[model samples]
Structure formats: C-alpha cells, structure tokens
Target: GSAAQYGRALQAMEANKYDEARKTLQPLLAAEPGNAWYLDLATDIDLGQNKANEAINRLKNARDLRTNPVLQLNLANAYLQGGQPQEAANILNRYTFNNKDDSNGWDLLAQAEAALNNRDQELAARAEGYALAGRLDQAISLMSSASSQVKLGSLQQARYDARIDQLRQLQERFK
Candidate 1:
C-alpha cells in the first residue's frame, strides 16, 4: 500500500501536480522520517509549491542529509530557493569539490554565487558545467573572466589559470 502510494506521489510530481504529491508524500514521510528517497520527493513537492523553508526544514533535520549526496543537493537547492544564497554556496562549494562531475551541482553553485553577487565565483562555477558539457570555449572565457577578477599572481588566480590551461588542453584534444 505504501509502495502504491509512493508511486502515485511520484506520478503526480512528474505531472506537475505538486499539491497531490505533497498530500501523498506526507504520510509516507511521517512513517519513515529518515528515508532519504521519500524526503527527497517531499523536498521536490515543497520546491514545486515554492515552500522553500518547509523543504529546508525537512531535509536539514534528516541525518541522511549529511551523508546522502542527493539529499545534500536538495537541501542546497532549498537554501537557494529560500533566498539564502550564502548557505547554498557553502554547501555547493564542498559538494562540487567532492563531486566534480555533477553538472547539476556546478550549475546550482553558480546560481548561488550569482545570488551572492560574487561574479568571479559565479563564472568559475559556471565554467565547470560548461566544460562538462563540452563547451570548452565558453568555459575558457568564463574562467578567464573569473581569473581577471582576482589579484594578479595570487594563488586563486594561479588556480584559475591552471584550470584554463587544463581546459585548453582538453579542447585541443577534440580537434
């Protein structure tokens, strides 16, 4: 019965029926408070309904949020949606660092940076997603802009330059 209910919730969520999904997920979540899967689904319904604060509260309290990457991502998204870009950025920095290949994290990280008015950080974060999408030129351009925003010859600048070089090499290989 729970399985069937969960499936209905998923179907409603997929169809953009956020209220329906929330109604179904509420009982499931109550039964299994630590269930990452159900919590993540509930987070989606909260987000769909623009109830970012509720989403954050749900995910943040779950011990699973600390260890589950998907839950972490959802929490980060909730923070961002709730207008707490700094909190989102704090999570995304660690998340992107640990899971470099996750383009979604990079994209969210960039948005967080943008919301915080950290132009350089935004560009740098966005560059990672561009590189992952095989858009080397765009990535390089963004990284270069990011690099320019930092002090010349600083460690941060060096890191940006190094990334640019790495992206360039990767681009050349495609030729």
Candidate 2:
C-alpha cells in the first residue's frame, strides 16, 4: 500500500504535478510520520513549488529518521536556492566525504563548493567527473594546484588513462 502510494506520488512528480504529489504524500506522511522516504518525497514536492524553507525543514525531519545521501543532496540544493551556499557546501562536503565513490556526489559537491567560492575544491570535484568521463589530461590539469596540493594514486592514475584512451578512440571513430 505504501509502495503503491509512493509510486503514484513519483508519477505525479514526473509529470510536474507538485500539488498532486504533495496531496498524495500528505496522507502517507500522516499514516507513517516517521517514514523518511515519504518525507523526502514531500520535500521534493515542496522544492518544486519553490518552498525552500519547507523543503529544508522536511528534509531535516527526514534526516532524523535516516541519513539518505540523495535527501542530503537535495537539502543542500535547497540551501543553495535559499542563498545559503555556505550551508549547502557544508552539507555537500559531508555528503561527498561519506559517499566518496559516488560520481554524482562528487559532481554535486563540485557545484555546491563552486557556489560557495571554493574554486579549488570545485576544480578537484570536477576533475573526478572529467576522469570518469575519460579525459585524463583534462582531469589532471584541473586537479593541479600552485602548491602541489593535489595527488592521485597509481590505480586512480591507471583508471584515468584507460578512460581517456577509451574516450579518445570513441571520438576518433565516431567523429
């Protein structure tokens, strides 16, 4: 029953029917006030409506139930939208540290950090994306700092090289 309601809510969200999604989630939240997933979805609806404070509050409440990485990410986005980039950066930094292997986390972290005027951290985070996208030289160049503060391990170096080679070949053959 809860899953069905959640599915409906998601469908509404996909259609940009934020009010409908909120309406659907409200009862579910009433029935299970402690459900983090429901609260997170409600936060999404609120965000779609430009209710930043409401979304942040809902996400914070959801966090009390469970520390969802995606929820945290969304909450950080809300903070950014509310002109609280420092808060957003703090949350995104924690999320990135907690989920270092998640490429999306790195990307979001980069965006949040950039908004907070942390260009070096932004570059480092973007470098991860470049590495994942198979642009080793671009990634390396982005990661470089004046004080030699950036470093990548041999395994990471190999992954970047392989990805770069793969992208290069694809580009050559396709374009």
Candidate 3:
C-alpha cells in the first residue's frame, strides 16, 4: 500500500539514503502532486543530494506553504542552497521576524546573509539564535560587533545597540 511505501521511504531518508528514498517516493509523489508533507520530504531528499534547484521547483506548488512554516523554511533553505541567497534572505527576514523564538529561522537567515556578504546582518542573525538559546553574553557580544560594522548613526546600528541593551536586560533577569 502507499502508506507502507511512504513509511519505507521515510526510513530510507532517515538513514541518509536519499537516492533510495527518492526512488521510493517517486510513485507517491505522482499520486499526490500537491501533498505538502510529501513535497517537504522531497525537498529534503533533493537538498541532501545537492539538487537544491530541484527542491525549490518541487516546492512551488505546495499550496500549504503559506500556512506551513516548515515548508516555508524548506523553500528558503532550498533558495539558499541553490545560490539564491537574496531570495532566501527575503523569505528568512520575514520568517525570523515572525518566529523570533525559532533558532532554525535565525540560523538559516545567518547563512543566507553570510552568502550575500552582509556581515552585519549575518552576525545579527546569529546573535538572535544565541539569544534565543539563552546565551545572552555571546548574543550581546556578537550584536556589539555587528553594531560596530554599520555606520555609527544609522538605524541598523541603532537597532543592534538596542538589541544589545535588551539582551543585557535579559541576561540580568536570568541571574
């Protein structure tokens, strides 16, 4: 049955055998073209095989992406892996902003920013992840470094400064 094969494919994927998983998933994918969970796993397999563009294309029709944060993250990760960091950053910017507590969003955003050579943004993204993990000192230190790289009087620098102060306050709260 399809469910049996689905579980089999999932097992192969979990075992890191993407080629096997992809082969097994082929029939299921064709059977349910718009199945969000299937598309998400397909994206993972494609990315594991270094076919990020394929993953991105596959996710295009995943109708649940708007309401599915996991799919959104997968699409952004696909963009980043496919050398489309700007697209990934655009998605991740909104994603991280909306999901501030999700270190995965910030982690992916950090890589996207790094790929785009936006050092300050990269550091800030990483700082957010650290902050969420309760590593306030590291977050504050990184935010400070990020703050120093921007024009001293700019909004971006000011935001980083404010974040550092907020992190310090949080650090005190945890003490």
Cα RMSD for candidate 2?
5.5
Which candidate's lDDT is highest?
1
Candidate 2 lDDT at 44 equals 75
In order, candidate lDDTs are 0.93, 0.72, 0.90
lDDT of 1 by residue, 1-175 (tens): 9999999999999999999998998999998987989988998999999999999998888987777898889999999999999999999998998899999999999999999999999999999999999999999999999999999989999999999999999988899
Please report, as a residue range, the 10-residue window in candidate 1 with the lowest summed lDDT: 58-67
Which pairs of residues clash in candidate 2, taking residues 3 or more apart in a chain or in different chains?
A: none
Select the stronger candidate by TM-score from 1 and 2. 1
Clash totals, every prediction:
0, 0, 0
Off by over 4 Å in 3: 1-3
Summing lDDT over every window of 10 consecutive residues in candidate 2, give the lowest-scoring window: 145-154
C-alpha RMSD values across all candidates = 1.2, 5.5, 1.9
lDDT of 3 by residue, 1-175 (tens): 9888889899999999999999999899998967877887898899999999889887877778767778888899999999999999988998987888898999999999999999999999999999888888999999999999999799999999999998998888778
Candidate 3, residue 133: Cα displacement in angstroms equals 2.9
TM-score of 2: 0.75
CA deviation > 4 Å runs, candidate 2: 63-66, 146-175
